């Protein structure tokens, strides 16, 4: 089970960065979580039920669906905010990425911490641009929303395309596959991190991408 990685790219206005990341992490996590496992000593276990809700974006003409866990939404909202202010204090560069990776924990011998083995990573590269009129702020609400549509479609296509998932664990091993720390929902073990990148050129891959258009 070697690590699958996926990259999406978005160009957004300043106000739109938080919703667009929220739109992407929640749709991946909605596919990458499950009902709470409730084990009995005999080995038997039951699965709880996941609720979902629609979220209208305020700066994008867009709606996405998230699991109805409010600790989870709080969790991602705070680190999505840590990404955005980090972009704001980046001044010029204008770029930064965010990554979400799912991993299993393997028990390690003393003194080494359990090694965390990713089986899937998601990366979102953002390019903030600031807009001048308030009608290209309004018009921008529409095509960012149209572009997140196809980003959501692609995420969904990749998930059917992706075959490996962790073996479903026993009660002793469940904390090495799932985050059992939430009440509503059981996400796979996951880490999200980010980086503020420095800009440089785009490398005359343009001709390769221009061959695909023709």
């Amino acid at each position: 089970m070697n690590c699958r990685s996926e990259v999406l790219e978005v160009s957004v206005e300043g106000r739109q960065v938080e919703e667009a990341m929220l739109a992407v992490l929640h749709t991946v996590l909605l596919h990458r979580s499950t009902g709470k496992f409730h084990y009995a000593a005999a080995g038997t276990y039951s699965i709880g039920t996941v609720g979902t809700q629609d979220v209208d974006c305020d700066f994008i003409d867009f709606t996405y669906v998230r699991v109805s866990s409010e600790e989870l939404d709080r969790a991602l909202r705070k680190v999505v905010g840590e990404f955005k202010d980090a972009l704001r204090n980046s001044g010029g560069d204008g770029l930064g990425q965010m990554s979400l990776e799912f991993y299993q924990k393997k028990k390690s011998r003393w003194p080494f911490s359990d090694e965390c083995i990713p089986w899937e990573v998601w990366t979102v590269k953002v390019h903030v641009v600031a807009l001048a009129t308030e009608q290209e702020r309004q018009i921008c609400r529409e095509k960012v929303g149209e572009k997140l549509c196809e980003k959501i479609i692609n995420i969904v296509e990749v998930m059917n395309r992706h075959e490996y998932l962790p073996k479903m664990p026993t009660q002793s091993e469940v904390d090495n596959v799932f985050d059992t720390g939430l009440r509503d929902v059981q996400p796979y073990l996951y880490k999200i991190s980010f980086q503020i990148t420095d800009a440089l050129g785009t490398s005359v891959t343009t001709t390769m991408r221009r061959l695909i258009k023709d």
């Binding site: 009902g35 996941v50 979902t52 809700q53 998930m159």
Partner: protein, 185 residues
Amino acid sequence: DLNSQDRKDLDKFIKFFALKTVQVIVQARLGEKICTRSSSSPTGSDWFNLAIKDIPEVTHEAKKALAGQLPAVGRSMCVEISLKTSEGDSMELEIWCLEMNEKCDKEIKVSYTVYNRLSLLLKSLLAITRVTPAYRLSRKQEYVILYRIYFGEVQLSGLGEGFQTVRVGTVGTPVGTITLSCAYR
């Protein structure tokens, strides 16, 4: 091959997946936002571990359409989302299509591997139904949205030349492969 109750559990899963499919699609074109609560202590009606409330009229419409039959090669189930304006002009926005190919697969445990993958496909369907063009139109409502479930024989050309399609996803079972998608104008 499949044991006797392997075949019947699979058939119960496909039925309720198909009934849940129409609920999600119709509830996403209904006009308003959908919010269901999670639950650590499950209920016996939350199929596939997902909280999806049933609309009774939609269940009945779904069941009459399937006529107690399940989709299979040739027999697909379709939800037609259409628009009738006050000028009486009617046109199909989308035709959601739950199909079944003959590519079988005796390598999946019917009981709970197929079950959890039907569940993920329902989760994809909740995501997808929000990001096709008919969704935003249905949330504004001049014109109203109409839904019709049928069991064909899928026929799409009313959508018009050049329509687009998106694959929601795919699930392999010992009786064939379940395909779900949307042709949209």
